[PDB]
Design a protein around this ligand. Structure first.
Ligand SMILES: Nc1ncnc2c1ncn2[C@@H]1O[C@H](COP(=O)(O)OP(=O)(O)O)[C@@H](O)[C@H]1O
Ligand SMILES: [Zn+2]
Ligand SMILES: [Zn+2]
Length: 698
């Protein structure tokens, strides 16, 4: 009688409509409803016999677009929970989970694809006639060889006009075409690749395959993590169940795709960024109907429906790209784990450098670890008192030339762009710390001051180091200053190129300097690189962002096993003003896992994630000012709201690395409800504003 309908609007509620008699429609189905004078597509959240709004103002539902729900029960429950946890409007959440074509109210069914083909006559006709009809002979000559899809005519030189003219002469016609892989699926033969550790990992996952279990597959690069994924998948597909494989945004390489395609005598569906809406819907349907054995995709592939999902694999579990930074700011990994729990299936998280969140979860009961085991010389250069050219010390340049004149490649790594730096003395290594809290000052040269972020303290930029008297105070964490402009005159006629995602000149080998700011794609290798230098180690060690050391440790550990693998002797050089920094020392001589153990214990002392939960609230006001006051009002509304516990820790209005406030709490659930209540009632009108649960900051 009454349908509670969700719309793709920035409002956290459902609009009511009347259900005319005869119109069958459950929750999870799409509807066409009136909205003002115009018309809108919506989703039925709930169907009640009851009454909610003024009954007379209730307009009826214009059309029921789906007979059956477009989300499954567990996926539906997942999205309901995600909306509650991320505090994002239920309508936007639900519509974001659907393909574009289904958002627009089109049928949830596979569109037929049509082709032109040469008729019986067109195959034999004297090619002496069309020799005066312009494009039609070219159109038919192509048709002689094979069919031509309609969505490909635009890539050719003859058009639909040339083809429809052949149609009228009876020489071309239009037709379209109509699938069970489980029968005739060969589990492959005993072929016996797996080693001891690999087989144990496969066995352990197999022995618990009929329930939920979150596994961390922790192994260094080359240990054969992918090989375990492939074997696990074989078992799952042997049960006639489907699989989802998630990779980072840059992970869908032709080599990776070919690897999966060749291993499985079963359909593999790849959700890459080049697909159009039809192709995406087609893939969505193939998965929903159980026709796709394996789906490979990136962050959004999490929302794909499955007739019978049997396993989830997330490769490069630590990658940032699993966190959506625009609109609905969900984390694909967490939601995937949630999805695995509700469906009661295994999820396998794979990384050579697992997130601290993940290692914490393993240390506690949450995840189970399966480990895989099975040279590169490293130098630490002291920048203190060194005359730099392009941020490069004499010692590094000396090593660089010895690699370049040997006709080899060199990679330099930097700290992206836009990040706000710390300030230190180039001569004695003094760092600007806040006097109140032991926290590094963030340098704001555009604002002419140093600002604390753990507390809120103002201090002007010193002209000289107060410790040693030197004027050579430098900003650390700046690499956007077009390094090539200084590298070209330092390295004459040597080609300079950027890695960050035509550039097949890298595969040519020879003397070359490569510049990167982010971690490299899986399988994507640089065999001609024999020297890797990590510039601005200080930017990572003295950042206001508490996760910078983690990201650096990951970057360092990745690139530590890519300096010309097996073939040539690789060299890793790090430049820093503090060579004997304890954290850095642990990383360099003990490895990532030991860094992680120490970093994790320091997170506990400082009461930081993953030991606590975080929620950010950002604001962007043109007014540069007043906006902090809006957050000041929101701070006070957050104070006395039921649930104080003298555990809730709120950072007052502090500018970002744009303004923000920070909420911290030992309990994830409690912090959710504190935000739930404070957002339920909002007092002053918002003109300035986003909400970020579990922020990765970067
Ligand atoms: N046991 C193996 N079988 C096949 N290929 C392997 C094996 N070990 C390593 N490789 C190759 O080395 C690269 C990285 O190893 P991979 O098996 O993907 O493990 P990981 O996922 O830990 O990097 C891949 O490109 C892969 O082709
Ligand atoms: Zn401070
Ligand atoms: Zn000094």
């Amino acid at each position: 009688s009454v349908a509670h309908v969700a719309l793709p609007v920035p409002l956290p509620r459902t609009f009511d409509y009347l259900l005319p008699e005869g119109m069958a429609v459950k929750a999870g189905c799409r509807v066409r409803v009136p909205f003002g004078k115009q018309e809108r597509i919506g989703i039925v959240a709930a169907v009640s016999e009851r009454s909610e709004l003024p009954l007379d103002e209730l307009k009826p539902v214009a059309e029921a677009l789906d007979d059956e729900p477009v989300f499954s029960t567990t996926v539906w429950r997942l999205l309901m929970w995600a909306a509650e946890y991320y505090h994002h409007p239920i309508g936007d959440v639900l519509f974001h989970a659907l393909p574009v074509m289904l958002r627009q109210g089109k049928p949830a069914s596979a569109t037929p694809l049509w082709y032109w083909f040469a008729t019986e006559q067109g195959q034999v006709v004297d090619l002496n006639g069309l020799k005066r009809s312009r494009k039609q002979q070219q159109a038919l000559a192509a048709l002689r060889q094979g069919k031509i899809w309609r969505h490909q005519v635009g890539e050719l030189e003859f058009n639909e006009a040339a083809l429809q003219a052949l149609r009228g002469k009876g020489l071309a016609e239009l037709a379209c075409e109509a699938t069970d892989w489980r029968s005739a699926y060969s589990v492959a033969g005993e072929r016996l690749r797996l080693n001891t550790e690999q087989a144990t990992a496969v066995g352990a996952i197999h022995s618990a395959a009929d329930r939920f279990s979150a596994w961390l597959l922790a192994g260094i690069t080359g240990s054969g993590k992918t090989e375990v994924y492939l074997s696990v998948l074989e078992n799952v597909l042997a049960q006639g169940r489907q699989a989802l494989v998630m990779v980072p945004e840059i992970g869908l390489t032709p080599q990776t795709i070919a690897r999966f395609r060749q291993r499985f005598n079963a359909p593999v569906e790849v959700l890459h960024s080049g697909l159009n809406d039809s192709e995406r819907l087609s893939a969505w349907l193939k998965a929903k109907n159980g026709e796709a054995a394996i789906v490979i995709g990136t962050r959004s592939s999490l929302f794909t429906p499955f007739k019978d999902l049997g396993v989830i694999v997330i490769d490069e579990e630590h990658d940032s790209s699993y966190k959506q930074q625009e609109g609905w700011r969900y984390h694909a990994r967490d939601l995937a784990v949630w999805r695995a729990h509700s469906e009661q299936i295994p999820i396998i998280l794979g990384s050579a450098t697992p997130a601290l969140e993940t290692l914490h979860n393993v240390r506690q009961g949450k995840y189970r670890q399966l480990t895989l085991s099975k040279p590169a010389q490293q130098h630490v250069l002291d920048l203190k008192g060194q005359p730099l050219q392009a941020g490069l010390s004499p010692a590094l340049i000396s090593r660089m030339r010895q690699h370049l004149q040997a006709d080899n490649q060199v990679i330099l790594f930097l700290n992206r762009r836009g990040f706000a730096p710390a300030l230190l003395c180039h001569d004695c290594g003094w760092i600007a710390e806040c006097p109140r809290c032991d926290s590094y000052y963030t340098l704001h040269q555009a604002q002419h001051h140093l600002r604390c972020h753990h507390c809120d303290s103002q201090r002007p930029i010193p002209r000289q180091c107060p410790s040693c008297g030197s004027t050579h105070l430098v900003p650390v964490g700046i690499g956007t200053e077009q390094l090539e402009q200084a590298l070209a005159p330092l390295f004459p006629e040597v080609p300079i190129s950027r890695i960050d995602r035509h550039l097949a000149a890298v595969h040519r080998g020879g003397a070359r300097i490569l510049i990167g700011t982010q971690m490299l794609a899986k399988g994507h290798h640089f065999p001609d690189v024999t020297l890797v230098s990590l510039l601005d180690v200080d930017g990572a060690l003295f950042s206001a962002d508490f996760r910078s050391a983690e990201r650096f440790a990951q970057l360092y550990t990745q690139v530590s096993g890519r300096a010309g693998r097996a073939g040539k002797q690789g060299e890793v050089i790090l430049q820093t003003h503090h060579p004997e920094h304890p954290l850095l020392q642990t990383l360099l001589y003990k490895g990532y896992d030991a860094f992680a153990e120490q970093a994790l214990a320091e997170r506990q002392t400082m009461q930081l994630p993953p030991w606590t939960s975080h929620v950010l609230i950002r604001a962007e006001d043109h007014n540069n000012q007043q906006a902090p006051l809006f957050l000041q009002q929101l701070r006070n509304l957050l104070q006395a709201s039921p649930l104080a516990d003298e555990k809730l820790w709120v950072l007052g209005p502090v500018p970002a690395l744009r303004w923000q406030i920070l909420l911290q709490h030992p309990s994830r659930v409690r912090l959710q409800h504190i935000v739930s209540g404070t957002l339920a009632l909002i007092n002053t009108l918002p003109e300035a504003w986003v909400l970020d649960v579990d922020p990765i900051e970067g």
